[PDB]
Design an enzyme around this catalytic site. Structure first.
Site, PDB file in Angstrom:
ATOM      1  N   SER B 244     -65.348  49.842 -96.461  1.00  0.00           N
ATOM      2  CA  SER B 244     -64.613  48.614 -96.423  1.00  0.00           C
ATOM      3  C   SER B 244     -64.531  47.947 -97.796  1.00  0.00           C
ATOM      4  O   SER B 244     -63.429  47.791 -98.338  1.00  0.00           O
ATOM      5  CB  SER B 244     -65.036  47.696 -95.291  1.00  0.00           C
ATOM      6  OG  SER B 244     -66.434  47.711 -95.200  1.00  0.00           O
ATOM      7  N   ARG B 329     -81.853  44.834 -93.191  1.00  0.00           N
ATOM      8  CA  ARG B 329     -80.987  44.175 -92.190  1.00  0.00           C
ATOM      9  C   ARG B 329     -81.401  44.608 -90.766  1.00  0.00           C
ATOM     10  O   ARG B 329     -81.316  43.857 -89.763  1.00  0.00           O
ATOM     11  CB  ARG B 329     -79.550  44.595 -92.387  1.00  0.00           C
ATOM     12  CG  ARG B 329     -78.924  44.134 -93.694  1.00  0.00           C
ATOM     13  CD  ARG B 329     -77.442  44.481 -93.775  1.00  0.00           C
ATOM     14  NE  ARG B 329     -77.238  45.928 -93.931  1.00  0.00           N
ATOM     15  CZ  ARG B 329     -76.075  46.606 -94.090  1.00  0.00           C
ATOM     16  NH1 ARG B 329     -74.889  46.005 -94.083  1.00  0.00           N
ATOM     17  NH2 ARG B 329     -76.120  47.958 -94.195  1.00  0.00           N
ATOM     18  N   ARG B 401     -68.028  40.509 -93.162  1.00  0.00           N
ATOM     19  CA  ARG B 401     -67.728  41.247 -94.367  1.00  0.00           C
ATOM     20  C   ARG B 401     -66.642  40.615 -95.293  1.00  0.00           C
ATOM     21  O   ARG B 401     -66.602  40.889 -96.503  1.00  0.00           O
ATOM     22  CB  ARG B 401     -67.466  42.708 -94.028  1.00  0.00           C
ATOM     23  CG  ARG B 401     -67.177  43.537 -95.271  1.00  0.00           C
ATOM     24  CD  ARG B 401     -68.376  43.561 -96.258  1.00  0.00           C
ATOM     25  NE  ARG B 401     -69.725  43.820 -95.695  1.00  0.00           N
ATOM     26  CZ  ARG B 401     -70.262  45.058 -95.539  1.00  0.00           C
ATOM     27  NH1 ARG B 401     -69.586  46.190 -95.850  1.00  0.00           N
ATOM     28  NH2 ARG B 401     -71.495  45.152 -95.075  1.00  0.00           N
ATOM     29  N   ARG B 421     -57.592  54.233-110.308  1.00  0.00           N
ATOM     30  CA  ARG B 421     -56.807  55.462-110.244  1.00  0.00           C
ATOM     31  C   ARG B 421     -57.522  56.589-110.945  1.00  0.00           C
ATOM     32  O   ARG B 421     -57.416  56.748-112.182  1.00  0.00           O
ATOM     33  CB  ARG B 421     -55.407  55.368-110.851  1.00  0.00           C
ATOM     34  CG  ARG B 421     -54.400  56.257-110.121  1.00  0.00           C
ATOM     35  CD  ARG B 421     -54.359  57.730-110.494  1.00  0.00           C
ATOM     36  NE  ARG B 421     -53.127  58.368-110.020  1.00  0.00           N
ATOM     37  CZ  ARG B 421     -53.038  59.662-109.730  1.00  0.00           C
ATOM     38  NH1 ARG B 421     -54.104  60.438-109.873  1.00  0.00           N
ATOM     39  NH2 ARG B 421     -51.867  60.219-109.303  1.00  0.00           N
TER      40      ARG B 421
HETATM   41  C1  LIG Z   1     -48.780  51.882-113.954  1.00  0.00           C
HETATM   42  C2  LIG Z   1     -49.787  51.201-114.810  1.00  0.00           C
HETATM   43  C3  LIG Z   1     -50.421  50.057-114.068  1.00  0.00           C
HETATM   44  C4  LIG Z   1     -50.831  52.118-115.313  1.00  0.00           C
HETATM   45  O1  LIG Z   1     -52.004  51.370-115.590  1.00  0.00           O
HETATM   46  P1  LIG Z   1     -52.908  51.774-116.837  1.00  0.00           P
HETATM   47  O2  LIG Z   1     -53.279  53.205-116.714  1.00  0.00           O
HETATM   48  O3  LIG Z   1     -53.992  50.766-116.931  1.00  0.00           O
HETATM   49  O4  LIG Z   1     -51.862  51.536-118.033  1.00  0.00           O
HETATM   50  P2  LIG Z   1     -52.464  51.871-119.485  1.00  0.00           P
HETATM   51  O5  LIG Z   1     -53.678  52.697-119.308  1.00  0.00           O
HETATM   52  O6  LIG Z   1     -51.290  52.410-120.246  1.00  0.00           O
HETATM   53  O7  LIG Z   1     -52.870  50.432-120.006  1.00  0.00           O
HETATM   54  C5  LIG Z   1     -52.927  50.097-121.406  1.00  0.00           C
HETATM   55  C6  LIG Z   1     -52.302  48.719-121.676  1.00  0.00           C
HETATM   56  O8  LIG Z   1     -50.848  48.782-121.732  1.00  0.00           O
HETATM   57  C7  LIG Z   1     -50.285  47.965-120.735  1.00  0.00           C
HETATM   58  N1  LIG Z   1     -49.144  48.640-120.116  1.00  0.00           N
HETATM   59  C8  LIG Z   1     -49.154  49.806-119.405  1.00  0.00           C
HETATM   60  N2  LIG Z   1     -47.989  50.138-118.894  1.00  0.00           N
HETATM   61  C9  LIG Z   1     -47.153  49.095-119.257  1.00  0.00           C
HETATM   62  C10 LIG Z   1     -45.788  48.814-118.986  1.00  0.00           C
HETATM   63  N3  LIG Z   1     -44.954  49.615-118.291  1.00  0.00           N
HETATM   64  N4  LIG Z   1     -45.293  47.703-119.526  1.00  0.00           N
HETATM   65  C11 LIG Z   1     -46.108  46.912-120.256  1.00  0.00           C
HETATM   66  N5  LIG Z   1     -47.398  47.039-120.548  1.00  0.00           N
HETATM   67  C12 LIG Z   1     -47.864  48.163-120.009  1.00  0.00           C
HETATM   68  C13 LIG Z   1     -51.406  47.839-119.717  1.00  0.00           C
HETATM   69  O9  LIG Z   1     -51.195  46.721-118.904  1.00  0.00           O
HETATM   70  C14 LIG Z   1     -52.587  47.658-120.640  1.00  0.00           C
HETATM   71  O10 LIG Z   1     -52.548  46.374-121.270  1.00  0.00           O
HETATM   72  P3  LIG Z   1     -53.865  45.438-121.329  1.00  0.00           P
HETATM   73  O11 LIG Z   1     -54.811  46.182-122.203  1.00  0.00           O
HETATM   74  O12 LIG Z   1     -53.475  44.192-122.054  1.00  0.00           O
HETATM   75  O13 LIG Z   1     -54.460  45.379-119.955  1.00  0.00           O
HETATM   76  C15 LIG Z   1     -49.114  50.621-116.011  1.00  0.00           C
HETATM   77  O14 LIG Z   1     -48.322  51.596-116.637  1.00  0.00           O
HETATM   78  C16 LIG Z   1     -48.168  49.444-115.608  1.00  0.00           C
HETATM   79  O15 LIG Z   1     -48.625  48.303-115.497  1.00  0.00           O
HETATM   80  N6  LIG Z   1     -46.996  49.796-115.291  1.00  0.00           N
HETATM   81  C17 LIG Z   1     -45.965  48.915-114.961  1.00  0.00           C
HETATM   82  C18 LIG Z   1     -45.877  48.846-113.461  1.00  0.00           C
HETATM   83  C19 LIG Z   1     -44.540  48.609-112.850  1.00  0.00           C
HETATM   84  O16 LIG Z   1     -44.142  47.460-112.688  1.00  0.00           O
HETATM   85  N7  LIG Z   1     -43.840  49.708-112.561  1.00  0.00           N
HETATM   86  C20 LIG Z   1     -44.370  51.036-112.778  1.00  0.00           C
HETATM   87  C21 LIG Z   1     -45.062  51.564-111.500  1.00  0.00           C
HETATM   88  S1  LIG Z   1     -46.865  51.348-111.500  1.00  0.00           S
HETATM   89  C22 LIG Z   1     -47.298  53.083-111.030  1.00  0.00           C
HETATM   90  C23 LIG Z   1     -48.799  53.448-110.783  1.00  0.00           C
HETATM   91  O17 LIG Z   1     -49.326  53.181-109.673  1.00  0.00           O
HETATM   92  C24 LIG Z   1     -49.564  54.129-111.968  1.00  0.00           C
HETATM   93  F1  LIG Z   1     -50.231  55.329-111.713  1.00  0.00           F
HETATM   94  F2  LIG Z   1     -48.644  54.433-112.945  1.00  0.00           F
HETATM   95  F3  LIG Z   1     -50.496  53.259-112.527  1.00  0.00           F
END
Ligand SMILES: CC(C)(COP(=O)(O)OP(=O)(O)OC[C@H]1O[C@@H](n2cnc3c(N)ncnc32)[C@H](O)[C@@H]1OP(=O)(O)O)[C@@H](O)C(=O)NCCC(=O)NCCSCC(=O)C(F)(F)F
Ligand SMILES: CC(C)(COP(=O)(O)OP(=O)(O)OC[C@H]1O[C@@H](n2cnc3c(N)ncnc32)[C@H](O)[C@@H]1OP(=O)(O)O)[C@@H](O)C(=O)NCCC(=O)NCCSCC(=O)C(F)(F)F
Lengths: 434, 437
Positions: B244, B329, B401, B421
């Site tokens: 959970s 518990r 919870r 992820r």
């Molecule tokens: C998908 C996503 C969350 C992946 O997360 P993550 O692996 O943490 O990205 P990252 O490792 O490249 O992060 C590095 C930095 O760049 C930023 N960044 C990553 N992708 C983007 C983006 N498309 N636009 C702007 N900034 C971004 C992150 O927010 C992070 O910034 P901070 O350090 O200030 O937190 C990220 O690419 C994102 O936010 N995407 C935009 C989301 C959206 O609106 N559409 C795309 C679908 S999200 C798909 C997923 O579920 C996935 F697997 F991709 F995460």
């Protein structure tokens, strides 16, 4: 021709395979857990065994070893289509082998005979308000369908771990069969004045009955639907929705409960909801800059979106490091069918600009687009403008993947997913201090 | 350390936290904390520590520690109802959130706030009143939570383009409202099913959350009120690796609102291997009585235990993924029985099992933990007070919870944890990665 029998024999081969393998490498190390991995959403940790599909950072998704183009060529098409039918995909994900056309037909048929909703679900859907988001409706409807669970009964009944997989298989076939019924009713009720969804033509394929229930008849929109549903089916198991289903499935919750929980995750803004988000942002873009903008004005629109603490929707990826074949695959489709579409052209123009922006910005790991960046533009073109529904479509596709794995997890008796958590204060103690 | 508004308190607390994690992460983000073997991957991540969860920490040998506190410690420190013995859940929530022990005032404000926010929308009520009696209580609860999402303040705000910084604020609002609505929802479920759809009455802005709950349930015994304070307090949190907790964490990391995150968690909780155990231990105990009769011999007990194992079944409420001893518990609940229902025949049978089960399990050589867990002792307490509808048992666990999970939810957002992820692997690829076997 009897997917259940097929499974019945593939199973023990594989059980054998792993045991022996585990005997040998059980304690062999495949990785290192770091302080940052823990704080970073398990980023880069290899923590799950998921069979139906694998994701390569550079090349993308492979479904049981096959790439998207490979599938596009290999899988059976419809009567006179060009787009692979999701039924094939499903057979492939479950079996590991390319289905023949007969096999594929058998599934269609199976999915037609099982599509049937309990009235309690019907009523519920019919009493929902129009302010309740479609994903929430979808999710709640599925949860409610759990009263029908066979696995849930069998289990209370005292079945042997051995047979778990068979129940899960039925629950799984039934859900996939009904999903379109629930999805369609939602659309209708929300956007079609509550008109009836009608019937399932036992002689059609799953996408085709779905589009009918939706009330769309462009034969090309049917083909899209087929492609759409095939490509969104699976994306390895570390993704939020899959992982969720997998984590929840582990406690032995039935497949209804499991899928429903996954929907709640797909609905998050950083996940499947991006489908819809992209669209909203693209619209607002068009309002401001207008129909046809200059690269120069586009840049600033993004440069802005950025220094303003917002993410560019549909760009970036947790794992992928290159342009998503799902994106490309969609773009080839537009190129063949709606090349002159303004929205489409914009999306296309965005493709050339965002990546460089997201490169000089220097934060994102993956400067490229993901499937999300391109699906909506396609839909909208065919008349489906109701953007708050797009994620539903993705959800209906994802069932294909997640459920295909659900069967396997139970067939191989994967246990409860339960890692160890730590507090910062404890982590500090472990290491010394920060 | 303290004054009244949690929100103000949090706001202050927050930035110092971030700074800390930041520097810590600065020196050691690359400092290796552990392994990753083939076995853990196939084994449902067993033994891998790969999640940060601030509210509670489970020591496999000692049990859960709340914010460094043990149950008995909470048991003494936490504020009680005017005239109670049992800690109030409100205090624990405060502790969990602030990491500090609340004052009585502080607790009172929480109660008031939860009283205040208590409101169900019509559509939810409509929905609940329309569900079939065969729809499991947990499904009802889960579907109700999901549908309440229409109300999410975080969702709204998010769509309206708020700043990552402000995120926690809306999650704090959404959580407070949800803690507040939960009993209404749960009570309606109970009413509908076991009380011929009678009305849940109203909320008494002056009562404590549990008290108002028991009122809406239709239970008036103060001993039961007292049991409820304990129950809701004790099932609160259990570190973040449980199904959970982990499910809420995973879903929330995607920016799904608290309603959604929580409902998903409910679906994990309803698993037979998880919170549903509550219920199973009671169905199992009943069957047992029916056969063996009331005053069974250890030898007859033992045997029946062996039957269960041979049927290829597990003994319910025993074993745990992490715990390696009797759950505190469990103990805690035994103490309460010892004090209030020393002679219940069912209670007695649980006690008997306690001396028999672990030896058989030891003997069978399978279970890493042959001792009891929380779920082994809870249903007997309920039953005794008249709450004999075991299909409802996990609902109460779920209500409890929400405290732990929502408390960390706010923190994760406050602290900016990202998207959960991981990387999946297939057997084939795994083999290839190694050499195969
Ligand atoms: C998908 C996503 C969350 C992946 O997360 P993550 O692996 O943490 O990205 P990252 O490792 O490249 O992060 C590095 C930095 O760049 C930023 N960044 C990553 N992708 C983007 C983006 N498309 N636009 C702007 N900034 C971004 C992150 O927010 C992070 O910034 P901070 O350090 O200030 O937190 C990220 O690419 C994102 O936010 N995407 C935009 C989301 C959206 O609106 N559409 C795309 C679908 S999200 C798909 C997923 O579920 C996935 F697997 F991709 F995460
Ligand atoms: C909680 C539990 C799922 C933990 O799983 P896990 O970490 O995999 O336990 P483990 O490694 O000690 O199990 C190893 C072997 O012992 C068996 N075993 C474990 N607990 C028991 C038990 N209570 N009775 C019989 N056999 C057991 C396991 O099933 C397994 O057998 P096999 O390898 O042949 O599949 C487990 O002990 C169990 O099944 N308990 C009974 C569940 C129940 O109805 N009520 C108790 C609440 S579950 C507590 C939790 O941690 C959970 F997270 F699951 F919610």
């Amino acid at each position: 021709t009897n997917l259940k029998d097929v499974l019945a024999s593939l199973i023990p081969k594989e059980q054998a395979r792993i045991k022996t393998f585990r005997q040998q490498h059980g304690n062999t190390a495949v990785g290192q857990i770091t302080v940052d991995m823990s704080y970073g959403g398990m980023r880069g940790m290899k923590g799950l065994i998921y069979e139906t599909s694998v994701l390569d950072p550079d090349e993308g998704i492979r479904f049981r070893g096959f790439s998207i183009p490979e599938c596009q060529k290999l899988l059976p098409k419809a009567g006179g289509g060009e787009e692979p039918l999701p039924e094939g995909l499903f057979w492939l994900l479950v079996t590991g082998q390319i289905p023949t056309p007969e096999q594929v037909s058998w599934v269609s048929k199976e999915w037609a005979k099982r599509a049937a909703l309990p009235s309690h679900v019907v009523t519920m859907l019919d009493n929902f308000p129009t302010n309740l988001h479609p994903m929430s409706q979808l999710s709640a409807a599925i949860t409610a369908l759990n009263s029908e669970s066979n696995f849930a009964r069998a289990y209370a009944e005292g079945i042997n771990r051995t047979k778990y997989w068979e129940f899960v298989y039925e629950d799984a076939m039934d859900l996939i069969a009904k999903l379109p019924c629930v999805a369609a009713k939602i659309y209708r009720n929300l956007y079609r004045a509550g008109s009836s969804i009608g019937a399932i033509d036992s002689k059609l394929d799953w996408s085709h009955n779905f589009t009918n229930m939706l009330g769309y008849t462009d034969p090309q929109f049917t083909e899209l639907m087929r492609l759409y549903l095939t490509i969104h089916s699976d994306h390895e198991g570390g993704n939020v929705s899959a992982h969720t289903s997998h984590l929840v499935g582990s406690a032995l919750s039935d497949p209804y409960l499991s899928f429903a929980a996954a929907m709640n995750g797909l609905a998050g803004p950083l996940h499947g909801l991006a489908n819809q988000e992209v669209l909203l942002w693209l619209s607002q873009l068009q309002k401001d800059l207008g129909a046809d903008a200059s690269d120069e004005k586009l840049r600033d629109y993004i440069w802005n979106t950025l220094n303003s603490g917002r993410v560019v929707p549909g760009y970036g990826h947790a794992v992928l490091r290159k342009t998503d074949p799902r994106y490309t695959c969609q773009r080839e489709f537009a190129l063949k069918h709606l090349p002159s579409d303004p929205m489409f052209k914009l999306v296309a123009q965005l493709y050339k600009i965002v990546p460089n922006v997201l490169l000089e910005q220097g934060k994102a790991k993956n400067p490229w687009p993901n499937v999300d960046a391109h699906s909506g533009v396609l839909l909208q073109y065919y008349g489906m403008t109701e953007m708050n529904y797009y994620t539903v479509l993705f959800g209906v596709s994802r069932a294909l993947g997640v459920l295909a794995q659900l069967i396997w997890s139970r067939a191989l008796g994967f246990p409860l997913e339960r890692p160890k958590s730590m507090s910062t204060a404890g982590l500090e103690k472990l290491s010394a201090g920060g």
